[PDB]
Design a protein around this ligand. Sequence first.
Ligand SMILES: *[C@@H]1O[C@H](CO)[C@@H](O[C@@H]2O[C@H](CO)[C@@H](O)[C@H](O)[C@H]2NC(C)=O)[C@H](O)[C@H]1NC(C)=O
Ligand SMILES: *[C@@H]1O[C@H](CO)[C@@H](O[C@@H]2O[C@H](CO)[C@@H](O)[C@H](O)[C@H]2NC(C)=O)[C@H](O)[C@H]1NC(C)=O
Ligand SMILES: *[C@@H]1O[C@H](CO)[C@@H](O[C@@H]2O[C@H](CO)[C@@H](O)[C@H](O)[C@H]2NC(C)=O)[C@H](O)[C@H]1NC(C)=O
Ligand SMILES: *[C@@H]1O[C@H](CO)[C@@H](O)[C@H](O)[C@H]1NC(C)=O
Lengths: 121, 119, 436, 438
Amino acid sequence: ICRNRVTNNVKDVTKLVANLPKDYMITLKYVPGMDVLPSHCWISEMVVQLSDSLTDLLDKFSNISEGLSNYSIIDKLVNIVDDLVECVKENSSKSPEPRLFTPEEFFRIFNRSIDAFKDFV
Amino acid sequence: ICRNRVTNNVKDVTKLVANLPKDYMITLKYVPGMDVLPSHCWISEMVVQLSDSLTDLLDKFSNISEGLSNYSIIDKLVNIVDDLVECVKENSSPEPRLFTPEEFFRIFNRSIDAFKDFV
Amino acid sequence: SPPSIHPGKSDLIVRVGDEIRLLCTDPGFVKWTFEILDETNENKQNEWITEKAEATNTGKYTCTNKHGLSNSIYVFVRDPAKLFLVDRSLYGKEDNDTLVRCPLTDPEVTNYSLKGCQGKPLPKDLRFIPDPKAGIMIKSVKRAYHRLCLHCSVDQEGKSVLSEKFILKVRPAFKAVPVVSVSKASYLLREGEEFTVTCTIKDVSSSVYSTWKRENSQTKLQEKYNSWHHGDFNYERQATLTISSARVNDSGVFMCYANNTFGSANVTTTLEVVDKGFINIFPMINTTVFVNDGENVDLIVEYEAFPKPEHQQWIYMNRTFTDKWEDYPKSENESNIRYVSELHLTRLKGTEGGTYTFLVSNSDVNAAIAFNVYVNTKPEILIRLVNGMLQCVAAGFPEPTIDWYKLVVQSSIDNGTVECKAYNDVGKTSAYFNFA
Amino acid sequence: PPSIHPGKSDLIVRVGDEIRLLCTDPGFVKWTFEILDETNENKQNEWITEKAEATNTGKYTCTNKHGLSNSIYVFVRDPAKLFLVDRSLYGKEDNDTLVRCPLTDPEVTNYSLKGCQGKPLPKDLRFIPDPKAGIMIKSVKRAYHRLCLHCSVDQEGKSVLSEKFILKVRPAFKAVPVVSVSKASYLLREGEEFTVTCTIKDVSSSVYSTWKRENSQTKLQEKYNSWHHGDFNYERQATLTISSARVNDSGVFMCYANNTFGSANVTTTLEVVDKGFINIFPMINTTVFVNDGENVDLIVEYEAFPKPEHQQWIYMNRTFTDKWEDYPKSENESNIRYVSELHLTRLKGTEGGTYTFLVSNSDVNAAIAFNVYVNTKPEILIRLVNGMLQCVAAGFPEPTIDWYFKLVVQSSIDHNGTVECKAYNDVGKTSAYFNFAF
Ligand SMILES: *[C@@H]1O[C@H](CO)[C@@H](O[C@@H]2O[C@H](CO)[C@@H](O)[C@H](O)[C@H]2NC(C)=O)[C@H](O)[C@H]1NC(C)=O
Ligand SMILES: *[C@@H]1O[C@H](CO)[C@@H](O[C@@H]2O[C@H](CO)[C@@H](O)[C@H](O)[C@H]2NC(C)=O)[C@H](O)[C@H]1NC(C)=O
Ligand SMILES: *[C@@H]1O[C@H](CO)[C@@H](O[C@@H]2O[C@H](CO)[C@@H](O)[C@H](O)[C@H]2NC(C)=O)[C@H](O)[C@H]1NC(C)=O
Ligand SMILES: *[C@@H]1O[C@H](CO)[C@@H](O)[C@H](O)[C@H]1NC(C)=O
């Protein structure tokens, strides 16, 4: 359920990783042990945190019309995650510590979070 | 002279300034008073310093096939900034300081626009 | 009675750091409850103490008791550090009122207000009502305000002080129906071929529901889906349907069908699956034709064929015909099944009549049709003396008739002259001999 | 010649130690000190320092009245900084190059050169030390471009590394520049704007390129575009224009490039005309004979500038039309030869007459005319009066009448009788048989 809300755009994530400085730093509240426990425990808190962090990151770039600016891609991903939030809040119906990540890793956490929906009670 | 080594790739610089985090930090060994006349005193040292800092910025990104990328644009900037060193050094260490990209590139463009007028 | 709380006033201010001590006096004591925002706590002692400082203690304290009895007291811990308590979540349904969680930790302030980021002013149409216990509320949230970013703001000591920062988000209410379009229109296929058709939907939101179903049945077929977000409030879906190999049963109506909470629409298409192929022919004129010397005639066929034609040819009297003919489809539409050829006979010379035949081929079938041709000729006439009798001899298709004053006709006769004349529809001619 | 104390060929000193010297001459002038770029001269013939820093490491030279001189070279052990470095590096293709990695503590070994990030060196970089300064790399070749290096010693069995060096190389020219021009040749009516482009491709920005009016020595006005298309791959475009042509502007223009390997040139020609024109050539003689039911085609080659703008066919002042084709005589990029043919089939006798074909362009219009005679076998006729037999024939040519038993002719001849008139012209034969009986 909700699987159809994730439009295919996510493939762009590989392009986006490549264009950010490999020592820029990105900031997230990270649910402990979420790497370990079965999906349905952590997923609810995690998906909120992502939407927050991303909307912060979006302020940093500037739009251009030509081609695929980073600003374009990020603007679309925000639209995906928010409707996942609504979908869980309406179909399923404490704050971790702040944490820092390099780009590659951070997107890995995001990508696995998406994958959790491709089969979810 | 050296008015020909400057290929027209520089127009891309405005695109590049858009596609970088406005809070990222860049480090340059700045000649004091490069903000004042004449051109000729600071220009000689300045092109060397620029070549170094740009080289390391190129070390960050990764190459990608389809559409423009930061890596690609930065590379052609390095090729120009090297040619000018060869031109000045064969025709003719300030402190490390930190800039957001908009400030830094304001410096860079002013430096290039010093050429196309010269001794 | 409800339970009595000591001291019984509605509201209390307390210093950050000061002790907080509340007692509930009821024989029926059960519970204490503490609420701020989404944080909540309970106690089963009949008295509540907290000697330490926390600003976060601020909010509501409730006491409950045996017969059902309940009473509550509300509390401030004034902190110069922490004027707001805050929650950076913010969502609104279009056309409803919406609440911004920045309730105030010390109520003794004025000009409690809402303000736009970075100096930029708020759209004029907003009207909103504050309250220190909730935060601040925005009326009738509407689609202009999407991604709008906010501060809520207060004046203390004439200095103007700002909340941590908020971005508002709005999710749309459907004013209109889905919009539905289909990749190509109607389909015809030779049996045992793959069949593939695509349906596309433009709509305001990713929540839209869409399906493929086959006329007169409710088995959902297998289908595969692809989607894009082309900007704000702008969503697109494509669906594709396939039959790997057709069997003639597969003929019929197919329907693409869409629904959202406002209403619905469709698009239909029809597949015909046929076992084999054909060529079918119609002459534009009668098969046999009559024409004068040096006259002009054009011959025409219209024909329906599938699969597409392989070659047409035009041939005459155990011989070819060449380069005086055209053959082109009757219509340019993708659906086109129908084809015409025309062939010119022009300044037709008088002997060339006979039989003209047309042949056409495709992968499965060959078909041929023939026309026959006879020539209107002015009479052509001649004389032969035989014995005592004088004979007058004339030819033409169609026959000449003669008066005294190819079909071959003969007339025999029993001072001045013998004149012999023949007439046909095509013309006339005559003969003269005389006696003195 | 001068004398220096202490008199070894070096000295080796602890970090912080005061460094003490006298340059011993009655012919003393100076002490002269340097390493890398930094350099100093001082007037004391004693030379003295309060406490040795690593930066004192290097060569010192006692400077004297003959210009006879003597030198001593000085090292400081300083366990933080085994290397001193200049980060800048450049190499001319196929020469050798020297890598600024001089050493502070000349008591270490295994001193050698190694790849960045653990990668291997390409196998060919034969390299030589001199711990007095640097490491040298022989015969730099184009594959090393923007390679990355570290400079390294074994010391106490530990392994110790410089900061990165990144190596960039200047190309040297194997070959001459390569040249192309936007199109080969031109024609213009007077005053039009005229424009051309010339393209050069090469390894470097330092290629030299100019336009010269043919057989004239003076440079014209031109404007430039260039791109670096990746490594060793540079492209230039040059554009030349005359805003409005006077006729004397006709002739030849040349684009020319030079580089230390050699030179290449490409050339283009221009003709300016005061007016348009049209010129016409028939296929066949203007006047043509055919026979009834035969076929004939009327064919013209004509050359025109500017392009043909009206083309029309008329017969006997009326539009006999739509049996004709017309097309450019060639597909080459500047063809102005044009061909049209008109095709007549199963021509009938009375239709003989006059045919004209006509062209206009904006500047000029021109017309050509043909006349045609279709010949026929004769027809024949019979008349009589005053006992004359009269035999009368018409055709082409004038037919010939012999008696036995639009060209026009007649003749006459004065118990049961059958006599006749039998005739041909060149086109054919016919026979007219009479019978007149008492
Ligand atoms: C349009 O939308 C809703 C679903 O969004 C349809 O709801 C039906 O609900 C029943 C169960 O209660 C399901 O079994 C059906 O599958 C749903 N219908 C369809 C066509 O799928 C609703 O029927 C649709 N029509 C309207 C007017 O809302
Ligand atoms: C698409 O869905 C609706 C409901 O089946 C159909 O609505 C009909 O549309 C026509 C033309 O407007 C009306 O005459 C009918 O009265 C509507 N109602 C019905 C029950 O037919 C629509 O036409 C549908 N599909 C097809 C193939 O027509
Ligand atoms: C212009 O182009 C032509 C052909 O590239 C050159 O013509 C040659 O000139 C030399 C003498 O200079 C002759 O020996 C050759 O036989 C010529 N033909 C060829 C194919 O080489 C000409 O030299 C060029 N002139 C300039 C100034 O560049
Ligand atoms: C290249 O350009 C200049 C100018 O014409 C000329 O002096 C020189 O001889 C040319 N050839 C070389 C190898 O430089």
